[PDB]
Design a protein around this ligand. Sequence first.
Ligand code: HEM
Ligand code: HEM
Ligand SMILES: [C-]#N
Ligand SMILES: [C-]#N
Lengths: 191, 193
Amino acid sequence: KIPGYTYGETENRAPFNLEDLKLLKEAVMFTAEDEEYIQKAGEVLEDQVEEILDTAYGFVGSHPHLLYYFTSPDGTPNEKYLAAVRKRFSRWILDTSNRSYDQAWLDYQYEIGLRHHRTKKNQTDNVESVPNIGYRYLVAFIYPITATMKPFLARKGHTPEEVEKMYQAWFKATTLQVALWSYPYVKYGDF
Amino acid sequence: VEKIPGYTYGETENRAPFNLEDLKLLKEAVMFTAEDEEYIQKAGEVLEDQVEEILDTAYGFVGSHPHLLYYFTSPDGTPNEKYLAAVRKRFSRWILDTSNRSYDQAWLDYQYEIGLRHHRTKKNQTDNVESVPNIGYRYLVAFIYPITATMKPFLARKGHTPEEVEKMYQAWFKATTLQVALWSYPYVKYGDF
Ligand code: HEM
Ligand code: HEM
Ligand SMILES: [C-]#N
Ligand SMILES: [C-]#N
């Protein structure tokens, strides 16, 4: 088990429902085919997670304004914070690949959005850090997250066609999630 | 040189609430560099001659989903074909702007405007139409995927190498993400952007 990780155990229901999710899946072109391919993506990625994490956090670490969101008040990275989040992000890779996108999934989507947002940021790990991750960067990061996965999706010898299907599934699923995470950021009634 | 109705790039009457430094830092967040400047322009060269088919594909997708076509509907629930047609011209222009404009303060000011036009702040004013008041933000983010995906097959059709196609597509992905991120502004609780 993973400190702070509360998938299936959250103490509120998402403000969006499974019909919302159906309609949003449609908007991101995500079908049963992507369910199959995202699970394949997971089989490919799961034993490469350490390099994936180094690559993702390598990017974050290289830009002071991104590393910012993990910083203590003194502007230095909070290493406790980075380490705890890293474990939860590792598990997110698997959840994205392996979970049914069902109500528990939706409820945790709400929770992850809340944790990036000022509502709950810094509470899971009991750290003193910056209060809010600007929404602009959540959207932005759809790109790096997907770009990070791409080279790894090839490393088990899958063909460019099969890799493209996995990569596209990942792209759709990452976009889907960030769309959901906007909820706590967006003015009531505008979501 | 005919005006595209409603298109007001470079003549908006608000300054964007985000500046050149905000943009630099956002470009950094989507991994956008001088290399993507090269390849986004190349992308424009390939797409510009295929826009009718690109638009038919994009709006085919929108039209195939009642909850998406919804945002172009008259209050009676029926699609407003004048609204669709006018927006289509401005979207066509946006393909060129994404490829061809320098992303400077003028570009930024139009980004803010485009976000306002999706948002209840300005939606339906540009074309003087009556329609649904707001496009739910969830769908703007969602549309990063179909907009990006729509371009991919077209990027191959001037016979660039698969590497160059992939780089054009990646530039397009970055630039689309970048813009949708900026368009969040009017939707986002003040101070949380
Ligand atoms: C595609 C966009 C993003 C994805 C997929 C993503 C993924 C994740 C995941 C899976 C977690 C842990 C969730 C949990 O608690 O179980 C997390 C937390 C966190 N992420 Fe992100 N993230 C994204 C955007 C960002 C950005 C732009 C930043 C800025 C550096 C960032 C920094 C953080 C921080 C500081 C936490 C801890 C929040 C807290 O205090 O609970 N994330 N992210
Ligand atoms: C990647 C996301 C999106 C992109 C790149 C995009 C692109 C554009 C562009 C370029 C325009 C015209 C801008 C101008 O006035 O010069 C526009 C307007 C419009 N778009 Fe989008 N769009 C996106 C998301 C959406 C979604 C999800 C919908 C829902 C159907 C939508 C529906 C509309 C509508 C109804 C207008 C007219 C708004 C008004 O009344 O002014 N767009 N869009
Ligand atoms: C976010 N890591
Ligand atoms: C959107 N058009």
